[PDB]
Amino acid sequence: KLPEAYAFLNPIVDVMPVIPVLFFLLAFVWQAAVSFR
């Protein structure tokens, strides 16, 4: 368990690790925005 100070901020930590995967996708969505130039 997190220290008692940050147990309130726990839900952000619940999603933080999966962020990078989304960066990947962003590349794809960015390429889609520019018409796969």
């Binding site: 368990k1 997190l2 220290p3 940050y6 726990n10 930590v13 619940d14 933080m16 690790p17 962020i19 990078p20 960066f23 390429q31 796969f36 130039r37």
Partner: protein, 450 residues
């Protein structure tokens, strides 16, 4: 947009990152941003595991993959592998997160607003992929950095609180490695020994003294090499066997890192020293030896004369003889007789498994350890059912050793494939026929028939 289109470049969108081969600043930005991504994942995952931590269960049952490393470094761990507090892990996570933010900003700045080519404005960070002196200079600088890192690990283990040692007297605990082994022969015996059974090329390091000595040697070698490559220039013999281009360097790195990934995968599956079983769970052979040991003890309690009961095949169902003559556990686990675990060594003599120690001087803690390891073997399923494939799903456990080994073996092979692909393409592009044949200078038509 001049550099960002299949026309200006000749590279499709899917193979779009290849447009950065000759662009120095943007390539640096991409590299830095990617490093920031690595650091961010490290910090985020450490925080995640600290959040989901439960003090009742051992770390290898909670599906944790990073707390084990920091515990092996000697952070918040007590005797026997008990976790005292999880504050240092939280500190490491937050520091990594902040540093990742900084690195990500730097990568974005260098990719977007930074000059495309560093050669014009900063003729110290600019390169050409073709001159050898600057390439070797960069290689030597980073080599010195790696040597300093290896030194830092040695320093941490020797004078910064020490590291966790399973083979420590009185049980596993944090201790200072006062006298590392510095003998070059014993250190390089690992490097130059066979990779087959009973040898364990670099996976078979036993004590922490060998680990510390090997790291001292690696740091010294890396420092010397980094100084040497900075000053010198590639020699004649190496100047005509290597392809000098960016993709060729990438292919070399890919082959090396695939080998390293294979080594780490097999290293997490067999080693007890740098991968204590109290944190990663028992290894493959360790579970089998634990099963044989606990059933031997149980049958001995009933009064059966162990080491005198012939097995169904007449071979001996409790104690056997190894093909080298050593006395080992019987059954199918005779293939794992090379095992050496901290909870089974007390029973081993020069001749092998001592019998007088087994008959009389047995310990309850050994029984508990063997039962726990047998009940938690590195067996599981993709959905983490746990146990044997035919077992019903009530337990929920897959050993972190299995996860690490499988994932890193997969990654290592695909990086070997990357090496093949990139080496072939780099050499073809350097030669000058990576796009087609020619249709007017077809070399097949100029060669003798056959």
């Amino acid at each position: 947009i001049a550099g960002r289109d299949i026309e200006s470049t000749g590279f499709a969108w899917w193979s779009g990152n290849a447009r950065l081969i000759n662009v120095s600043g943007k390539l640096l930005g991409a590299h830095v941003a990617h490093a920031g991504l690595m650091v961010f994942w490290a910090g985020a995952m450490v925080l995640f595991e600290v959040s989901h931590f439960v003090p009742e269960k051992p770390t290898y049952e909670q599906g944790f993959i990073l707390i084990q490393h920091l515990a092996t470094l000697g952070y918040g761990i007590g005797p026997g592998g008990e976790i005292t507090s999880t504050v240092p892990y939280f500190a490491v996570g937050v520091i990594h997160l902040i540093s990742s933010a900084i690195l990500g900003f730097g990568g974005i700045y260098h990719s977007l607003l930074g000059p495309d080519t560093l050669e014009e404005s900063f003729p110290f960070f600019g390169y050409d992929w073709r001159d050898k002196n600057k390439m070797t200079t960069i290689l030597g600088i980073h080599l010195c950095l790696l040597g300093l890192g290896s030194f830092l690990l040695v320093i941490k283990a020797m004078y910064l609180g020490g590291v966790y040692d399973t083979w420590a007297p009185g049980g596993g605990d944090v201790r200072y490695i006062t006298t590392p082994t510095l003998n070059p022969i014993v250190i390089f015996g690992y490097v130059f020994r066979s990779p087959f059974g009973g040898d364990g090329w670099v996976v078979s390091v036993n004590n922490m003294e060998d680990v510390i000595g090997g790291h001292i040697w690696v740091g010294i070698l890396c420092i010397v090499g980094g100084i040497w490559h900075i000053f010198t220039k590639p020699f004649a013999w190496a100047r005509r066997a290597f392809v000098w281009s960016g993709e060729a360097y990438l292919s070399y790195s890919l082959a090396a890192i695939s080998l390293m990934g294979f080594t780490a995968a097999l290293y997490s599956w067999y080693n007890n020293t740098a991968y204590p079983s109290e944190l990663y769970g028992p290894t493959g052979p360790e579970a089998s030896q634990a099963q044989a040991f606990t059933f031997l003890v149980r049958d001995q309690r009933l009064g059966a004369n162990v080491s005198s009961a012939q097995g169904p095949t007449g071979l001996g169902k409790y104690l056997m003889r190894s093909p080298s003559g050593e006395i080992i556990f019987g059954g199918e686990t005779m293939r794992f007789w090379d095992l050496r675990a901290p909870w089974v060594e007390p029973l081993r003599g020069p001749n092998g498994l001592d019998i007088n120690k087994i008959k009389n001087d047995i310990q309850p803690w050994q029984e508990r350890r063997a039962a726990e390891y047998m009940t938690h073997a590195p067996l599981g399923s993709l959905n983490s059912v746990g146990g044997v494939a035919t077992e019903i799903n009530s337990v929920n456990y897959v050993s972190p050793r299995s996860w690490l080994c499988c994932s890193h073996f997969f990654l290592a092979f695909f990086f070997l494939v990357g090496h093949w692909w990139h080496a072939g393409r780099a050499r073809a592009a350097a030669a000058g026929f990576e796009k087609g044949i020619d249709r007017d200078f077809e070399p097949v038509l100029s060669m003798t028939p056959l």
